Design an enzyme around this catalytic site. Structure first.
Site, PDB file in Angstrom:
ATOM      1  N   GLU A 107      62.720  -7.064 106.279  1.00  0.00           N
ATOM      2  CA  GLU A 107      63.568  -7.608 105.221  1.00  0.00           C
ATOM      3  C   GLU A 107      64.888  -6.850 105.114  1.00  0.00           C
ATOM      4  O   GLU A 107      64.990  -5.693 105.544  1.00  0.00           O
ATOM      5  CB  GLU A 107      62.833  -7.622 103.871  1.00  0.00           C
ATOM      6  N   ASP A 134      69.484  -0.769 106.064  1.00  0.00           N
ATOM      7  CA  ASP A 134      70.203  -1.927 105.522  1.00  0.00           C
ATOM      8  C   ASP A 134      71.288  -1.525 104.498  1.00  0.00           C
ATOM      9  O   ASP A 134      72.309  -2.203 104.372  1.00  0.00           O
ATOM     10  CB  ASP A 134      69.208  -2.859 104.815  1.00  0.00           C
ATOM     11  N   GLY A 144      46.553  10.721  95.619  1.00  0.00           N
ATOM     12  CA  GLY A 144      46.861  10.391  97.017  1.00  0.00           C
ATOM     13  C   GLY A 144      47.666   9.096  97.162  1.00  0.00           C
ATOM     14  O   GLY A 144      48.749   8.969  96.574  1.00  0.00           O
ATOM     15  N   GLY A 194      56.741  -9.311 109.663  1.00  0.00           N
ATOM     16  CA  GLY A 194      58.057  -9.814 110.087  1.00  0.00           C
ATOM     17  C   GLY A 194      58.936 -10.258 108.918  1.00  0.00           C
ATOM     18  O   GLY A 194      58.549 -10.075 107.763  1.00  0.00           O
ATOM     19  N   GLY A 213      60.575 -12.415 105.973  1.00  0.00           N
ATOM     20  CA  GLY A 213      59.882 -13.258 105.007  1.00  0.00           C
ATOM     21  C   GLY A 213      58.400 -12.894 104.896  1.00  0.00           C
ATOM     22  O   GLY A 213      57.984 -11.809 105.322  1.00  0.00           O
ATOM     23  N   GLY A 267      47.306   6.416  95.640  1.00  0.00           N
ATOM     24  CA  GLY A 267      47.543   5.901  94.295  1.00  0.00           C
ATOM     25  C   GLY A 267      48.986   6.127  93.839  1.00  0.00           C
ATOM     26  O   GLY A 267      49.616   7.150  94.159  1.00  0.00           O
ATOM     27  N   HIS A 304      51.080  -0.476 108.777  1.00  0.00           N
ATOM     28  CA  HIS A 304      51.634   0.782 108.264  1.00  0.00           C
ATOM     29  C   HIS A 304      50.600   1.660 107.515  1.00  0.00           C
ATOM     30  O   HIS A 304      50.942   2.401 106.588  1.00  0.00           O
ATOM     31  CB  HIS A 304      52.909   0.475 107.454  1.00  0.00           C
ATOM     32  N   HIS A 348      53.387  -2.051  89.059  1.00  0.00           N
ATOM     33  CA  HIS A 348      52.009  -1.863  89.526  1.00  0.00           C
ATOM     34  C   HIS A 348      51.663  -0.376  89.777  1.00  0.00           C
ATOM     35  O   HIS A 348      50.558   0.028  89.412  1.00  0.00           O
ATOM     36  CB  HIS A 348      51.733  -2.745  90.748  1.00  0.00           C
ATOM     37  N   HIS A 394      49.640  -8.894  85.609  1.00  0.00           N
ATOM     38  CA  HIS A 394      50.676  -9.920  85.709  1.00  0.00           C
ATOM     39  C   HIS A 394      50.806 -10.771  84.438  1.00  0.00           C
ATOM     40  O   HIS A 394      49.817 -11.175  83.821  1.00  0.00           O
ATOM     41  CB  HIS A 394      50.388 -10.870  86.879  1.00  0.00           C
ATOM     42  N   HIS A 428      59.039  -4.487  89.857  1.00  0.00           N
ATOM     43  CA  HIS A 428      57.678  -5.057  89.887  1.00  0.00           C
ATOM     44  C   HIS A 428      56.663  -4.120  90.554  1.00  0.00           C
ATOM     45  O   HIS A 428      55.597  -3.868  89.992  1.00  0.00           O
ATOM     46  CB  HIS A 428      57.665  -6.435  90.567  1.00  0.00           C
ATOM     47  N   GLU A 429      56.961  -3.592  91.745  1.00  0.00           N
ATOM     48  CA  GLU A 429      55.985  -2.762  92.462  1.00  0.00           C
ATOM     49  C   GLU A 429      55.829  -1.365  91.825  1.00  0.00           C
ATOM     50  O   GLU A 429      54.694  -0.926  91.665  1.00  0.00           O
ATOM     51  CB  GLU A 429      56.257  -2.754  93.977  1.00  0.00           C
TER      52      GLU A 429
HETATM   53 CA   LIG Z   1      57.743  -9.549 105.673  1.00  0.00          CA
HETATM   54 CA   LIG Z   2      50.611   8.930  95.224  1.00  0.00          CA
HETATM   55 CA   LIG Z   3      65.688  -4.008 106.946  1.00  0.00          CA
HETATM   56 ZN   LIG Z   4      52.364  -8.249  91.591  1.00  0.00          ZN
HETATM   57 ZN   LIG Z   5      50.723   0.432 102.758  1.00  0.00          ZN
END
Ligand SMILES: [Ca+2]
Ligand SMILES: [Ca+2]
Ligand SMILES: [Ca+2]
Ligand SMILES: [Zn+2]
Ligand SMILES: [Zn+2]
Lengths: 164, 36, 36, 36
Positions: free
Chosen positions: A102, A25, A91, A77, A79, A93, A69, A123, A129, A119-120
């Site tokens: 997306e 993308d 590992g 898919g 959204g 983690g 995955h 985490h 949160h 955000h990710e």
């Molecule tokens: Ca999705």
């Molecule tokens: Ca890792």
């Molecule tokens: Ca894409």
């Molecule tokens: Zn979150």
């Molecule tokens: Zn995964």
């Protein structure tokens, strides 16, 4: 609830990342700059140092994938799910997985990889949160002008309760 | 012989998955009228 | 009798909750001025 | 002694985040024709 429940953290300040694969993308240098600026948002406020590596094992893997995955967090898919992290640890983690159905972007249109990665990766650092709509660790992303971005005070409270 | 103590508490659960993406913005109004 | 060793370290926590729904996109810019 | 109770359940994880705010609204169509 601005911290992981019980709470896993990194027990070292020098952290590593690897981009497993790139999204079609975006330009390669824009995926690089989105993830680099997303790590910088978090290194501004703690003792942590973040480094990209190009072969071997990293602490944090950044991955683009679609559908199922290889963990109990299957994508879905266009959204619905756009990403998932994992908390600090060995590992799988720390690892940050993003959905390829997306459409990832530098900009206000599409899906802003820098803001999602804040955000990710949050985490991947062990954040919980916030319950405040102004927070980046709130259960709601809002698009904000990335050129003037700031953490909320409840995100700074969270990350400073885990590091420093 | 007597039973042993309870184990340590379990590891924390994994973080939650991202929710439904926002819908496409409304199309813009028709442009201004043509010049004389 | 001798008390036993501890039990196994607990089942891992259940996964975190799925996200809610994205705010809708900002409305489009007005169109270009019309034909002469 | 027997090897104990299998440990307290782990803490249930922190949530998702709503999916990214909606796309840019398409620019409006060009305006109506000018006055004859
Ligand atoms: Ca999705
Ligand atoms: Ca890792
Ligand atoms: Ca894409
Ligand atoms: Zn979150
Ligand atoms: Zn995964």
């Amino acid at each position: 609830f601005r911290e992981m429940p019980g709470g896993p953290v990194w027990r070292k300040h020098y952290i590593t990342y690897r981009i497993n694969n790139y999204t079609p993308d975006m330009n390669r240098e824009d995926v690089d700059y989105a993830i680099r600026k997303a790590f910088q948002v978090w290194s501004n406020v703690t003792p942590l140092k973040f480094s990209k590596i190009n072969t071997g094992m990293a602490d944090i893997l950044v991955v683009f994938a679609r559908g199922a995955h290889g963990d109990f967090h299957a994508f879905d898919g266009k959204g619905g799910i756009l990403a998932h992290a994992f908390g600090p640890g060995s590992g799988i983690g720390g690892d940050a997985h993003f959905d390829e159905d997306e459409f990832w972007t530098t900009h206000s249109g599409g899906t802003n990889l820098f803001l999602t990665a804040v955000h990710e990766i949050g985490h991947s650092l062990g954040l919980g949160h916030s319950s405040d709509p102004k927070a980046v660790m709130f259960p709601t992303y809002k698009y904000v002008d990335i050129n003037t971005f700031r953490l909320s005070a409840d995100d700074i409270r969270g990350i400073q309760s885990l590091y420093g | 012989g007597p039973p042993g103590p309870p184990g340590p508490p379990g590891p924390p659960g994994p973080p939650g998955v991202v929710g439904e993406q926002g819908e496409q913005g409304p199309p813009g109004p028709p442009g201004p009228p043509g010049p004389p």
